[PDB]
Design a protein around this ligand. Structure first.
Ligand SMILES: *C(=O)[C@H]1NC[C@@](C)(O)[C@](O)([C@H](CC2CCCCC2)NC(=O)[C@H](Cc2ccc(OC)cc2)NC(=O)[C@H](CCO)NC(=O)CN2CCOCC2)O[C@@H]1C
Ligand SMILES: [Cl-]
Ligand SMILES: [Cl-]
Ligand SMILES: [Mg+2]
Ligand SMILES: [Mg+2]
Ligand SMILES: [Mg+2]
Ligand SMILES: [Mg+2]
Lengths: 241, 225, 204, 231, 244, 250, 243, 196
């Protein structure tokens, strides 16, 4: 069964190495959630520090790709970091060649074209990661574009990745059935972060301390991550209402 | 003689229609305002093939890029790609270019030199007629020109070129790129140089020319049974 | 030393009413020495005519190059190339040698077999297209051809009138050039007919 | 088993069998011994012949005027690595006008072996080396194994029945380390050592190869009648 | 390394056969039959289309009969995409010969070069051979009218009449029975159709199932004409011979 | 990169089958239904937008792609394989044609270049075939309207109408009943929409259906005036609304 | 099965078995540790004395990158020398262009990306080492550890090789009993203790203690080996604690 | 061209005239010669316009990729990349670049990269054809730890003398102020500076 060792077709028409790469995605046992405001895009991800020897400040699956673009990974860190460096390089090269900031959705297409090549080139193994790219695009506005080992990408109103994605997915699908709109109707990112955390607590049925969470916010003309203290500020606000 | 200037809600390009070989006129009706994208145009001066080839190359790539990114192409993109390509060839592609257009960022006007230098401006002229044109533009350009004003000033800048510069002549081509409108290309916008009726007809009495031999040429594929 | 004036030669192309004409001299020399009085500069691929003046080794090379490309074109497209399309192929092909050019002055003539529209063009040695409505000139007596054409020419000449005009353009321009003449050829081209005439000119 | 087809494959216990089989060619190779004092370093080598018509395989190569090795295993591999060391000694001289440190020779050999143990197509080197040298920090003896592992020792032995000599040196450590400014007594101590690794055959005149280097001694090889003194 | 996954497309069997050539020949055995017949005054190419559908656009369709220049055509049997790669090579090689010598390439020189490309893929490179067999129909002024065949091995031979694809055994017996040397194009047309009409695995042989072509020195004033028959003309020659 | 895979990964098996082409054609079958119908005065290509999540914005994923102003593509099989074939197909229309002749390639020749790209993925070292069948509809001055099918092998065929993927056997029978040589483009969009309802389980509206045409020239879509010979793209993606209008009269 | 015969192949679980096997080569190695102190980092390592014939203090294991970075590793020693060689190229090239000495995070990813590249292809073998490294940059002290997968995180303390479980247990106590931080001269002593303690797992052969350190106050933020009086003071402290 | 940068108490100020010339013809009279390679690292350009644009572009690319990976690069690091390009392509470049930027650690810093592709860290720097006329003036009048208003005056006076005597300089005097406060662009027209 060498049709199961490299990226050639099984008799069924399947690429098993692509399928097994999707399963590496979940190895970290971390759940990620992205939602859009009017003005912003918020990505939350679980942060587990099991070892008391680890420097918790160095444990992250959220990457600042460019000034505009943030990227959360669901997968093992080495494949995550491989993809981060590449996206960063491709983003800076785009700006040099074409005289404008690489849009979130074009980066995602570029990174998904690279992924597709690893599913047709036998010498290259697919990355075991799902890349969630977020910006406030100067044309399309708040944006979420996700990439997988198959070389598939699509735009999202909101999305979730990880072991317990389906629970988070149906929670958000239920909310967008009530509001009937494409985004969280909220002026301040501070209240779209609060929303995202609140709907992750409901869906996963778990509470969160400042250290159990990792947040990314994309406003117009910058992407940034929240410190532990900034999250705590958010947690307080959810509790007091 | 090529020029461009900005007005209230857009940018305009002007060019003469003369091509020279040493001191003779090779062409009296050539188009110096080249298409890059639907709403991005490029005036060409310098080596004619070089200006024609570099605008077609970048215009081809801008189309592939527009398709790839599913976006209207930007002027700063055409600017960067022309300028990086001219720079690579160290002047040997002897193209002098005025780039203008509308994109989602607004309206833009840039000049590009053969060695790969770019300039930003509200009014620009290039080529042998550029000093004639720049004198008119420096006399009459103000902020918030209307379109009727803009087209008058641009066409006056090219006329300065036509009359006063031997390198420039024949007709005025113009291209208007207003925000939220279709760019309009106005080839032979002015025709101020129509050859006067000849004194005589030089049409010869038939048989005037001595002919040694005749023959039919076979241009069809396969004469068949 | 100047490649464009070692061998000599001229080509002139004119449009008429539902016709085009292309004509050339027959001289090939090594400067002052005349060598061949049979060197034709007008070639055709299907119904598209190409005259070429300049360095004779490039005249021959480019003909062999455009027979090759137009043959393949026809085998894939399943149709003869048209004058508009062939003109672009010539320009492409000249500009691809930008920094090592062929030393030629090409001239395309023909009628679009679909539209029936007469078409001529000329080129600099690096592919800049001049698409004239009236006439194109090329070669060592180009100045002399410009003068003759710009005076003699008038639009919408019948086939047998345009023959007389174009012949008189070439013959009188060749006679004021040391490196052109020695005989000449004129192609009268109609949509489904093509006459070729050898002109009796002075042999100096 | 299924993990011995090439040098790019790890075994389930974290082993490189291709390397371990290269290591094995060393054990099948004829014994050689190295040892040093503060003043001199000595190679003694038991050379092997095919039969009684044949010559004895040379086991000692000179690398520069202050450094050379003895080989056990594939000779052609020893040639490649000795050629490489010759060039590294030679580069140091020509560019920096500087005698290559024996510890730096060790590191260069360790990194050349290692490339063959991680990259497909290539094979490990099938040979072990004992490098001796005198440099700016006195007397040195290295042991090279083709895994890449290189070790600075007072004394060692490699090849068939090398465990004999190595135990002798392990006992004599306090005695032979003090043999300063007496090359003949240091060579004796090595000849005696290599004897512990003999069975049936005994040291003859065209059997025994010795090399020495030290304070005022260039690297020089004694064969044939030049080693009779020591039998 | 990657050695584990190499099929080794360019080795001998213990019997001294090239597996991949043989299995390609097996593939080509299942392809629609193509027949070539050479006469004194011309050459016939007939071929059977494999994919019958009522909704296939037939008049713009080419799977079997291609043109290499004005004097040389091929009929394909095998993977059409593989044949199209080789066809484009052959087209260029004839036009490099024309640019070098100022003469149309002799038929044999073109066929040897294609056949040399095919040979290449069987002896070096480790790629799969081209799953294609060609009948070559051509004219030149040295040998006149010529048929040749090539196959994945790179072997080529010349024939008075030949078949490739399905049922060549049956096809070759029927040709050998009815073919005579003093034969003419009109007869060779009738022989070619009759032979497909017998060997075909289809219930009946119809215009929508065929590609058909001729090479005649029966052009005006002793020239050479390649005629790729349009579907209507095939349906006419099917009535004329008496098969429909 | 130490790409040692210089040998074919597609080889003949003893039966004469090319395994990887067959398995790619199996991936095509499992793919959502797409179809093309050629009218006298245009061509229609149509597919279902099978949305992987209701949180996905299916507008951002186009299954129907413009290749040139006058040529359009749709597929059944692996989307990402289609996407890179679209990128390659657009570029080759420029590099091997537009930069030479100053016009866009005719439909057959652009098809021919895509075919070639896929034939290479079937024979080159260290690659699997493309897991897609394309339908390519175009216009060109001298051939008129055309519809082409391209298979993982490199093989292409001209069709009056066809379907590929999931229910293509049923869809192809449906079309064989309904097709004639006197269809107008509006008659072809009607038959396209009918045919595609048979293979669709769920919602059937303008938001779950992607339909495009090769029709008349759209000078209004051009973006610029003053060039009499550029008369505008013949390729047009129908809008969510335009589809729903035709579904009321269905 | 067969999933483990080729590097870069995913098993149906989503695992790369060759990388997991590389880890067994690492677990086989001698014990190495790192300790993050107030202003710097300390690296210690167990060196097994196979034979009396090994010259003391002469087979040095801890390798310096640039002037400010210390690297120690457990497992296949030549794999660790191959990585550091690459490290030295990365830090040179970075200094050449950007002038400043490479920051410890920048350096950590440079190794990270290289080790991860040796899991992407069947034509290469994964690295057979875990690497503990760190130094002092403009933002302060930094300690990292880099597994055969290319995985790496910041640590308060790190440990790998055969004595890792023992070391980690002892490192956690230090973290828990010194929240305000550990001084450089304190960490050196603790490093000696933790290597000795973790020498019960490798107890058959006797060993040689090797310590290095970078400290803003004690070495001017440069990497130095701990030699002479300071080394013996640490060895004596450790010898007193095991008794 | 006339260009300078001056360190003062609060940060640094970049100054330049606006004249671009093709011989004696003024090709552009409102040129912006102050170019951003990062938020608070700017350079002054002199030499071949093509050459220095191509260089500043590559440097902006490099510092943007730097920021993605390692965060905010020091002014020194921007100087080092300019130098690397200038020095290694010295046989094909006519570029004379002044680099000036603000950190909170280092505060205001000026580096000059003359035609050698050498690097020099200076309290102030003058360059361009117009700089020869104001060595005397600037050496006499420069002090360390000037206020913002003093440093605007020093540059306005200095570039004013440079413009008066250099035919290749002229137009408006553009400045860029670089402090913890951020990034303030200034412009001074002829009718102000000429009459100084
Ligand atoms: C306004 O200022 C106009 N002034 C007129 C003119 C002619 O200078 C020009 O720049 C015009 C640019 C246009 C012409 C129409 C097509 C688009 C470009 N240029 C020419 O007409 C150009 C002259 C020229 C020759 C040579 C050099 O560098 C040495 C610069 C300019 N003519 C050509 O290039 C002719 C065209 C033949 O029909 N051919 C040649 O010069 C052939 N040689 C080219 C150089 O290399 C050797 C071969 O328009 C501006 C805007
Ligand atoms: Cl891409
Ligand atoms: Cl500038
Ligand atoms: Mg692969
Ligand atoms: Mg004459
Ligand atoms: Mg004469
Ligand atoms: Mg001045």
């Amino acid at each position: 069964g060498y049709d199961r060792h490299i990226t050639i077709f099984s008799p069924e028409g399947r690429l098993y190495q692509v399928e097994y790469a999707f399963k590496a995605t979940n190895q970290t046992n971390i759940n990620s959630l992205a939602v859009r405001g009017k003005d912003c895009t918020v990505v939350i991800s679980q942060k587990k520090v099991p070892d008391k020897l680890l420097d918790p400040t160095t444990v992250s699956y959220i990457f600042c790709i460019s000034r505009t673009i943030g990227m959360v990974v669901n997968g093992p860190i080495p494949d995550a970091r491989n993809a981060a460096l590449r996206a960063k390089a491709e983003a800076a090269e785009f700006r040099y060649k074409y005289g404008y900031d690489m849009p979130c959705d074009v980066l995602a297409k570029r990174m998904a074209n690279l992924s597709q090549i690893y599913t047709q080139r036998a010498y290259m193994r697919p990355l075991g990661v799902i890349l969630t790219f977020v910006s406030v695009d100067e044309e399309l506005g708040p944006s979420i574009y996700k990439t997988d080992p198959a070389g598939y990408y699509v735009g999202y109103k909101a999305t979730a990745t990880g072991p317990k994605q389906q629970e988070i997915t149906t929670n958000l699908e239920n909310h967008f059935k009530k509001s009937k709109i494409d985004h969280i109707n909220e002026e301040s990112w501070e209240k779209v972060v609060e929303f995202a955390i609140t709907h992750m607590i409901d869906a996963l049925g778990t509470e969160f301390s400042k250290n159990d969470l990792e947040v990314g916010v994309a406003t117009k003309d910058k992407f940034f991550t929240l410190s532990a203290e900034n999250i705590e500020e958010r947690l307080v606000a959810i509790a007091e209402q | 003689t090529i020029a461009g200037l900005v007005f209230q809600d857009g940018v305009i390009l002007g060019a003469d229609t003369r091509a020279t070989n040493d001191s003779v006129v090779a062409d009296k009706s050539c188009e110096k305002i080249h298409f890059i994208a639907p709403k991005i145009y490029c005036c060409g001066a310098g080596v004619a093939a070089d200006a024609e080839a570099v605008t077609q190359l970048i215009g081809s790539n801008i189309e592939l890029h527009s398709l790839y990114t599913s976006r209207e192409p930007r002027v700063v993109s055409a600017l960067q790609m022309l300028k990086q390509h001219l720079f690579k060839y160290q002047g040997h592609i002897g193209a002098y270019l005025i780039v203008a257009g509308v994109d989602p960022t607004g309206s833009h006007l840039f000049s590009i030199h053969a060695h790969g230098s770019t300039d930003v401006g509200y009014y620009l002229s290039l080529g042998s007629g550029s000093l004639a044109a720049m004198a008119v533009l420096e006399s009459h350009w103000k902020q918030d020109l209307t379109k009727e004003e803009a087209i008058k000033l641009a066409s006056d800048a090219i006329q300065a070129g036509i009359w006063n510069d031997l390198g420039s002549g024949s007709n005025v081509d113009v291209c208007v790129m207003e925000i939220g409108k279709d760019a309009e290309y106005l080839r032979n916008y002015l025709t101020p140089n129509v050859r006067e009726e000849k004194q005589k007809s030089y049409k010869f009495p038939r048989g005037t020319t001595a002919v040694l031999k005749e023959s039919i040429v076979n241009i069809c594929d396969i004469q068949e049974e | 030393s100047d490649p464009s004036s070692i061998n000599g030669g001229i080509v002139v192309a004119m449009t008429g009413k539902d016709c085009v004409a292309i004509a050339c001299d027959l001289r090939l020399g090594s400067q002052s020495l005349g060598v061949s009085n049979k060197f034709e500069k007008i070639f055709h691929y299907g119904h598209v005519f190409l005259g070429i003046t300049g360095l004779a080794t490039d005249v021959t090379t480019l003909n062999e190059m455009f027979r090759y490309k137009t043959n393949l074109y026809k085998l894939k497209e399943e149709r003869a190339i048209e004058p508009e399309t062939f003109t672009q192929l010539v320009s492409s092909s000249l500009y691809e040698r930008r920094f090592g050019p062929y030393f030629v002055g090409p001239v395309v003539a023909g009628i679009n077999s679909k539209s029936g529209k007469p078409f001529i063009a000329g080129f600099d040695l690096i592919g800049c297209i001049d698409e004239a409505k009236d006439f194109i000139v090329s070669g060592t007596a180009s100045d002399q051809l410009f003068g003759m054409c710009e005076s003699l020419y008038e639009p919408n000449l019948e086939p047998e009138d345009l023959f007389e005009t174009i012949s008189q353009a070439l013959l009188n321009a060749a006679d004021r050039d040391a490196l052109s003449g020695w005989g000449a050829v004129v192609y009268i081209i109609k949509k489904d007919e093509v006459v070729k005439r050898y002109l009796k000119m002075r042999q100096d | 088993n299924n993990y011995d087809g090439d040098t790019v494959t790890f075994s389930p216990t974290g082993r490189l069998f291709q390397v371990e089989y290269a290591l094995e060619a060393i054990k099948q190779g004829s014994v050689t011994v190295g040892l040093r004092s503060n003043t001199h370093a000595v190679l003694v080598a038991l050379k092997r012949n095919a039969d009684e018509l044949s010559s004895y395989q040379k086991k000692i190569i000179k690398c520069d005027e202050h450094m050379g090795l003895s080989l056990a295993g594939l000779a052609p591999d020893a040639r490649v690595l000795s050629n490489y060391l010759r060039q590294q000694c030679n580069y140091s001289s020509l560019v920096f006008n500087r005698k290559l440190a024996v510890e730096r020779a060790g590191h260069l050999l360790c990194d050349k072996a290692q490339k063959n143990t991680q990259s497909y197509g290539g094979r490990p080197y099938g040979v072990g080396l004992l490098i001796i040298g005198y440099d700016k920090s006195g007397a040195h003896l290295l042991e090279f194994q083709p895994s890449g592992n290189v070790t600075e020792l007072y004394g060692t032995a490699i090849g068939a029945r090398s465990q004999g000599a190595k135990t002798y040196l392990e006992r004599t450590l306090d005695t032979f380390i003090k043999i300063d400014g007496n090359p003949d007594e240091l060579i004796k101590a090595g000849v005696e050592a290599i004897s512990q690794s003999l069975r049936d055959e005994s040291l003859t005149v065209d059997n025994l190869s010795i090399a020495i280097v030290g304070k005022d001694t260039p690297f020089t090889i004694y064969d044939g009648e030049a080693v009779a003194k020591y039998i | 390394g990657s050695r584990r996954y190499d099929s080794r497309t360019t080795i001998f069997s213990p019997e001294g056969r090239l597996y991949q050539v043989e299995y390609a020949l097996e593939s080509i055995s299942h392809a629609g039959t193509a027949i070539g017949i050479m006469a004194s005054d011309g050459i016939v190419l007939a071929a059977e289309r494999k994919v019958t559908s009522t909704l296939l656009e037939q008049d713009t369709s080419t799977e079997k009969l291609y043109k290499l220049n004005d004097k040389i055509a091929v009929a394909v049997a095998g993977l059409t995409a593989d044949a199209e790669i080789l066809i484009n090579t052959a087209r260029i090689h004839a036009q490099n010969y024309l640019k070098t010598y100022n003469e149309d390439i002799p038929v044999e020189i073109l066929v040897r070069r294609l056949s040399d490309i095919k040979q290449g893929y069987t002896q070096h490179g480790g790629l799969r051979p081209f799953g294609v067999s060609f009948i070559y129909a051509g004219y030149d002024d040295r040998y006149g009218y010529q048929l040749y065949t090539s196959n994945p091995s790179g072997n080529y031979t010349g024939w008075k009449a030949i078949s490739v694809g399905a049922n060549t055994s049956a096809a070759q017996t029927l040709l050998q029975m009815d073919y005579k040397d003093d034969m003419k194009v009109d007869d060779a047309i009738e022989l070619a159709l009759k032979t497909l009409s017998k060997t075909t695995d289809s219930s009946a042989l119809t215009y929508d199932r065929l590609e058909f072509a001729t090479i005649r020195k029966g052009a005006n004033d002793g020239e050479v004409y390649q005629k790729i028959f349009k579907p209507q003309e095939i349906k006419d020659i099917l009535v004329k011979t008496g098969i429909t | 990169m130490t790409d040692r895979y210089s040998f074919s990964l597609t080889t003949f098996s003893p039966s004469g089958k090319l395994g990887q082409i067959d398995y790619a054609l199996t991936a095509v079958k499992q793919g959502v239904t797409s179809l093309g119908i050629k009218a006298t005065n245009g061509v229609v290509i149509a597919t279902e937008k099978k949305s992987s999540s209701p949180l996905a914005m299916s507008e951002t994923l186009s299954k129907v792609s413009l290749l040139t102003p006058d040529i359009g593509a749709v597929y059944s099989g692996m989307g990402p394989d289609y996407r890179v074939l679209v990128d390659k197909s657009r570029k080759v229309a420029h590099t091997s044609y537009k930069r030479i002749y100053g016009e866009y390639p005719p439909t057959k020749l652009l098809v021919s270049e895509v075919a070639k790209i896929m034939q290479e993925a079937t024979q080159s070292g260290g690659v699997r075939p493309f897991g897609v069948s394309l339908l390519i509809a175009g216009h060109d001055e001298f051939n008129g309207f055309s519809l082409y099918q391209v298979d993982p092998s490199g093989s292409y065929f001209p069709w009056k109408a066809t379907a590929i993927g999931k229910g293509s056997v049923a869809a192809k029978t449906f079309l064989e009943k309904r097709w004639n040589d006197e269809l107008e483009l509006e008659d072809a969009i009607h038959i396209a929409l009918l045919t595609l309802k048979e293979s669709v389980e769920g919602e059937f509206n303008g938001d779950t259906i992607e339909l495009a045409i090769i029709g008349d020239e759209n000078p209004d879509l051009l973006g610029y005036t003053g060039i009499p010979t550029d008369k505008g793209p013949r390729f047009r993606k129908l809008t969510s609304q335009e589809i729903n209008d035709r579904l009321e009269a269905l | 099965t067969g999933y483990d015969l080729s590097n870069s192949v995913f098993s149906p679980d989503g695992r790369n078995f060759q990388v997991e096997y590389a880890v067994k080569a690492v677990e086989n190695g001698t014990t190495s540790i790192g300790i993050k102190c107030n202003d710097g980092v300390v690296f210690a390592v167990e060196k097994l004395i196979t034979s009396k014939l090994l010259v003391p203090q002469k087979n040095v294991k801890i390798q310096v990158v640039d002037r400010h970075i210390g690297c120690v590793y457990s497992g296949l020693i030549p794999d660790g020398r191959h990585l550091v060689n690459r490290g030295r190229e990365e830090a040179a090239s970075f200094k050449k262009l950007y002038k400043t000495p490479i920051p410890i995070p920048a350096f950590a990813d440079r190794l990270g990306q290289y080790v991860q590249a040796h899991t992407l292809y069947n034509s290469v073998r994964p690295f057979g080492v875990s690497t503990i490294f760190g130094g002092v940059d403009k933002n302060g002290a930094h300690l990292y550890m880099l597994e055969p997968s290319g995985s790496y995180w910041g640590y308060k303390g790190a440990a790998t090789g055969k004595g890792r479980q023992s070391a980690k247990a002892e490192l956690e106590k230090l973290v828990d009993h010194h929240p305000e931080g550990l001084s450089a001269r304190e960490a050196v002593k603790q490093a000696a203790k933790i290597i000795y303690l973790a020498h019960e797992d490798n107890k058959e052969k006797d060993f040689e203690l090797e310590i290095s350190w970078c400290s803003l106050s004690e070495t001017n933020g440069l990497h130095k080996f701990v030699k002479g009086d300071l080394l013996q003071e640490a060895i004596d402290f450790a010898q007193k604690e095991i008794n | 061209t006339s260009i300078m940068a001056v360190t003062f108490k609060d940060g640094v100020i970049l100054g330049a005239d606006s004249r671009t010339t093709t011989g004696a013809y003024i090709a552009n009279r409102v040129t912006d010669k102050l170019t951003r390679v990062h938020d608070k690292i700017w350079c002054c350009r002199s030499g071949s316009a093509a050459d220095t644009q191509a260089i500043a572009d590559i440097v902006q690319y490099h510092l943007e990729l730097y920021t993605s990976q390692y965060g905010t690069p020091s002014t020194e690091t921007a100087a080092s990349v300019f130098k690397e390009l200038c020095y290694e392509n010295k046989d094909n470049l006519t570029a004379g670049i002044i680099v000036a930027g603000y950190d909170d650690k280092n505060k205001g810093e000026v580096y000059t990269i003359p035609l050698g592709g050498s690097v020099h860290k200076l309290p102030y720097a003058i360059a361009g054809s117009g700089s020869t006329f104001i060595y005397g003036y600037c050496d006499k009048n420069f002090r360390e730890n000037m206020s913002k208003e003093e440093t605007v005056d020093f540059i306005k006076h200095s570039l004013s003398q440079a413009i008066k005597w250099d035919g290749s300089s002229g137009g408006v005097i553009r400045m860029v102020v670089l402090t913890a406060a951020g990034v303030e662009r200034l412009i001074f027209y002829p009718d102000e500076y000429e009459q100084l």
